[PDB]
Each structure stands twice: as structure tokens, then as C-alpha cells.
Amino acid sequence: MEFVRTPDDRFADLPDFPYAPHYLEGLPGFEGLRMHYVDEGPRDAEHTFLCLHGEPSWSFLYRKMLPVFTAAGGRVVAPDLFGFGRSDKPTDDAVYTFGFHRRSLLAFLDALQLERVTLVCQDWGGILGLTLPVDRPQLVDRLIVMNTALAVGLSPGKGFESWRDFVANSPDLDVGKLMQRAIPGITDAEVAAYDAPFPGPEFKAGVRRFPAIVPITPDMEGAEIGRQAMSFWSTQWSGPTFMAVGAQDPVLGPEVMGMLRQAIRGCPEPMIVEAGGHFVQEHGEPIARAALAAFGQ
């Protein structure tokens, strides 16, 4: 499997992200590839917050939420999917499938021997993370869910389809410019942190493919796993749940999230973060504090 690795000097300057890199090699089924993750807090923490990112972000996106989690005595573990952040990046777009990403996540959990987590998810971090209980029913003991969907073989919307086509029409998608449009208040130094993984178009195979592999017709890969996952959350799940929604998201926003709320057994009414957009973790410090207070922490 062909791949590129982003030079370390790209990750020097980063605002509010001093966290040491940690890496895993030899993951079963990804022999050759190196995965980066953030790991902070005591490694015998009562609560480990597994923070999964989506498209086209990385663990950098959890940097405002992480210190609230560690302040509370938590461990925070935030992997960069292959194709993203400081992880290695396959160059052939065809390697990125729903299964490729899901298996990575499972290999990642097994390697750290993480068996009990507060799942913190958004976008593809939730499309994938929300399906983990299908295989590992006792893995998630609490959920903090943000702007995401359970992909069951339907479109999330007209907004989704436009976005998908736009990515398809952008062979060298400017990730930093996209984030500038999408995140109210983002500074120039934070924009460069989202550009940082991607020195050129050969680094963006996973960025290009992601929207195209969301299972939005019933028989695309991952759709049936999505349906199984919805079954779990609607009929077997009974853990503590907190939902927050960034209101300015014109794809996976309040609309899609109100429906998901009702499909997650016991999920209370969402915290609406009017300051936030799709990448709501950018306005996520109050999300982390409110989750914790809701969980009795």
C-alpha cells in the first residue's frame, strides 16, 4: 500500500496544541502504516474520553475540549485516521473505504487495550464511532455526540449532496480555506494547523474520498452496519448521553441531530451551541463542561 508521511516541521507552530505525538505501528491489516494519536492524562483514569475526528480534520480539533476532560481527572485519547493529521496517508483514493477506517479504529483500540470509553464524536468520528458497539457492545459506557449522523443508507440532506459533489469537484481541496468558511472566529494560525497535514494534492486522497463513501443509498458499504448500530442505540443502549449541536452547520446540524436524539435511547434534549458550526468542537469548551456536569462529574 503506497503512502506518504507529512514532515514533522509542518506541526511545529500549533496554537493551543503542545501535546506530544504518540504513534502505533504494525496494526494488523495496516502493516507499514504509522498512526498518530494524542494521549493525555493518567493512564489509569476512571474515564477515558475517546475523541474521534472526521472530515477533513484531525485530533487538533479536540484541543479546546481536551483540557476540560483532563481537568476532570480524565484520560483523553484522540487518534488521527489514516489520511489525516500526523498519521500516514495512503495515496491511492480507492483504498479509503468505510471498512478501511472502521478496522483501523478497532485495531487502534485493541493496541491500547482501551475496553471502556466515553465516546466523544462528530462527523465521520460519529459515523464510524457510533457503529463500534455492533462489534464491541461494552466498549462505550457514555456518549458525548456532536454534529454527526448514523449513516443507514439515506442522504443526510440537499446540503450533504452539494458538499459531496463539491469535494468530488476539488482535486486539491484547500482544507484551510474550507475551515475558514466553516468555523466562526478561526484565526490564521488555526487555519494553517488544518492545512498542516496536507503539503500537496498527493496527501489528500483520504480528504477527497470521504464524502463519497458516506453510505447514503441502502446498499453502499457500511449502510447495513449503520442499521445495526441504530438498532443498538435505539433498543440496547442505556448509558449516560449528552448531545451538543453547532447551530450554524448547514449539513449535519440541528435538523439531523434532533432526529438522532430521538433515536438514542435516553438522550436528553441537545445543548444548542449557537456560536458553533459543523466543527462544533471549535466552540466546544462549554460542551465539555456541560457534558461533565450532566454526567454528575
Side-chain angles (χ1 to χ4, degrees):
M1 171 162 305
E2 295 192 81
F3 72 92
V4 282
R5 183 173 291 175
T6 316
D8 278 340
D9 72 5
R10 299 281 291 191
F11 302 108
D13 265 85
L14 304 184
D16 298 330
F17 199 76
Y19 315 113
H22 298 268
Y23 302 103
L24 287 173
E25 274 162 63
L27 299 180
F30 308 82
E31 284 89 358
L33 304 178
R34 188 181 68 162
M35 180 172 279
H36 167 259
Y37 66 105
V38 173
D39 200 345
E40 298 289 325
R43 302 192 187 168
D44 61 351
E46 179 184 24
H47 289 299
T48 299
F49 300 79
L50 173 67
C51 300
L52 302 186
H53 76 88
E55 166 77 343
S57 65
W58 58 287
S59 49
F60 180 79
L61 175 50
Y62 282 106
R63 81 200 176 284
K64 301 189 199 169
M65 294 184 81
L66 161 347
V68 169
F69 296 146
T70 60
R75 185 184 183 182
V76 185
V77 172
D80 290 343
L81 298 171
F82 293 126
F84 306 79
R86 305 182 75 157
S87 285
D88 295 341
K89 303 177 177 59
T91 53
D92 180 353
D93 299 43
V95 313
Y96 298 93
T97 61
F98 185 99
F100 172 90
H101 287 304
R102 200 176 173 266
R103 297 192 299 270
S104 76
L105 283 177
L106 294 164
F108 176 77
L109 292 172
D110 300 345
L112 281 62
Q113 287 188 301
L114 291 191
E115 287 188 315
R116 274 321 171 291
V117 304
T118 295
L119 173 65
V120 184
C121 65
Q122 175 267 343
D123 190 75
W124 267 99
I127 297 176
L128 290 153
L130 294 170
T131 72
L132 300 167
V134 172
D135 280 41
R136 311 293 163 85
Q138 301 162 297
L139 176 68
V140 186
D141 69 339
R142 317 185 303 186
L143 182 62
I144 308 180
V145 53
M146 292 165 288
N147 295 56
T148 192
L150 261 167
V152 296
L154 299 170
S155 180
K158 304 187 221 221
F160 175 76
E161 289 153 29
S162 308
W163 155 250
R164 173 206 68 187
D165 286 339
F166 172 71
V167 175
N169 299 334
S170 304
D172 196 18
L173 189 72
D174 191 321
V175 164
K177 285 277 187 38
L178 164 73
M179 304 301 253
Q180 212 168 33
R181 292 171 162 87
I183 297 145
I186 190 160
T187 72
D188 288 344
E190 289 161 345
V191 174
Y194 283 117
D195 278 320
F198 309 116
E202 69 275 23
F203 292 80
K204 299 186 187 164
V207 163
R208 284 191 288 277
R209 206 61 139 209
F210 243 149
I213 63 168
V214 176
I216 66 157
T217 62
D219 291 336
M220 287 178 77
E221 175 177 337
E224 179 58 43
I225 292 181
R227 293 189 211 100
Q228 286 170 348
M230 193 165 61
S231 182
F232 167 91
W233 297 107
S234 287
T235 68
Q236 313 280 330
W237 170 246
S238 64
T241 308
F242 190 84
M243 178 179 285
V245 188
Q248 310 182 38
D249 184 356
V251 181
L252 305 184
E255 45 274 1
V256 156
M257 291 299 282
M259 308 283 282
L260 181 54
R261 184 266 258 223
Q262 188 56 44
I264 298 179
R265 194 145 81 89
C267 186
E269 82 161 5
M271 177 187 198
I272 302 308
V273 183
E274 299 290 345
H278 177 77
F279 303 99
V280 73
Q281 308 96 315
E282 291 287 333
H283 296 81
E285 178 190 338
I287 305 175
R289 302 186 184 279
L292 292 214
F295 297 164
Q297 205 157 343

